[PDB]
Design a protein around this ligand. Structure first.
Ligand SMILES: O=C(Nc1c(Cl)cncc1Cl)c1ccc(OC(F)F)c(OCC2CC2)c1
Ligand SMILES: [Mg+2]
Ligand SMILES: [Zn+2]
Length: 331
């Protein structure tokens, strides 16, 4: 089905043993599956959690949909291609298994979070919301300058479900489809970085009033509480590159800066003001990664670590180490 060469056969399976671990190498997975990491990992994650059985999704329909989804990720965009969506989906799969959230979420909520991660950047053009708005692009006109890309990703992901041969949610009840849709919209719209501060603040509240039962698991009474953790989960996963091993983090940084600089060039050709971190002639990649961790990634992930204490300590230590590595690359 994947046509994985007889030579990449066991290499792939050897990589997929780390499926449930933070240390999984999605680059290795993309290379052994003929650059189909999103399809590959999503199939693996769905078999592990036995989601195909629970929601009666035929294996053919699942593959057909994921393949088409993966094809809507642009392979010429340096960072926001299917490897990132696969990375965010697999990272979310690991966060959902963290001991402090054990048995807290329904199967339907697990399905929604992983599906959301998978579609969260589909058909990304390699430019930011602010670029699309400043250039009066069709998408900004379409979405009235609000969470332009995030709304688009959702629109494409759900639209690919319209044909029967691609409808993975055909066996959910009407009710389940409507709840899953609400959760997915919510989670994907929350990946808009302009909502980041609002999200971090609400998560700090959740940590302050966190009630963990005798089982050592968090108590989340209402839907409001659960979707609040899920939004933050996908958001942390989206901002997890600097929490990975240094070998992986540096390749992600290479990819993001290649995309950001490409937008700098486009802004320069059009006579627009260049965002300072986006300017290949002046910006220090190393200073920007240090600023990224101190002011965005560390504040979020330390808060997340508090809520799931102590499951995330390794993540925090890797983050401080990677930060110090980039700081040591600045003269
Ligand atoms: O913003 C990001 N991601 C992103 C998210 Cl989480 C949500 N919405 C849009 C984007 Cl671009 C993002 C992701 C990864 C980065 O570096 C490394 F980890 F690869 C990075 O560098 C900051 C810095 C150079 C100026 C920025
Ligand atoms: Mg995005
Ligand atoms: Zn993303």
């Amino acid at each position: 089905r994947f046509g994985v060469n007889t030579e990449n056969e066991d290499h792939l399976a050897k990589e997929l043993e780390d499926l449930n671990k933070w240390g999984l190498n999605i680059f290795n997975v993309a290379g052994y599956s003929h650059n189909r990491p999103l399809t590959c990992i999503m199939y693996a994650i769905f078999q592990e959690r036995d989601l195909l059985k629970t929601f009666r999704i035929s294996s053919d329909t699942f593959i057909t949909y994921m393949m088409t989804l993966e094809d809507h990720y642009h392979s010429d965009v340096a960072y926001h291609n299917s490897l990132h969506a696969a990375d965010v989906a697999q990272s979310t799969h690991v966060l959902l298994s963290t001991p402090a959230l054990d048995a807290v979420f329904t199967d339907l909520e697990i399905l929604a979070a992983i599906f959301a991660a998978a579609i969260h950047d589909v058909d990304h053009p390699g430019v930011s919301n602010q670029f699309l708005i400043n250039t009066n692009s069709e998408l900004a006109l379409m979405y009235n300058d609000e969470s332009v890309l995030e709304n688009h990703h959702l629109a494409v992901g759900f639209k690919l479900l319209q044909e029967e041969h691609c409808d993975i949610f055909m066996n959910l009840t009407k009710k389940q489809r409507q709840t899953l849709r609400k959760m997915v919209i919510d989670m994907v719209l929350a990946t808009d970085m302009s909502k980041h501060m609002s999200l971090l603040a609400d998560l700090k509240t959740m940590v302050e009033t966190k009630k963990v039962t005798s089982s050592g698991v968090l108590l989340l009474d209402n839907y409001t509480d659960r979707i609040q953790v899920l939004r933050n989960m996908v958001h942390c996963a989206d901002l997890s590159n600097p929490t990975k091993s240094l070998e992986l983090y540096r390749q992600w940084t290479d990819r993001i800066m290649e995309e950001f600089f490409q937008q700098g060039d486009k802004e320069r050709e059009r006579g627009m003001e260049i965002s300072p971190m986006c300017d290949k002639h002046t910006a220090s990649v190393e200073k920007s990664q240090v600023g990224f961790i101190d002011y965005i990634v560390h504040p979020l992930w330390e808060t997340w670590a508090d809520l799931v204490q102590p499951d995330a300590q390794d993540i925090l230590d890797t983050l401080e180490d990677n930060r110090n590595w980039y700081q040591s690359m600045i003269p």
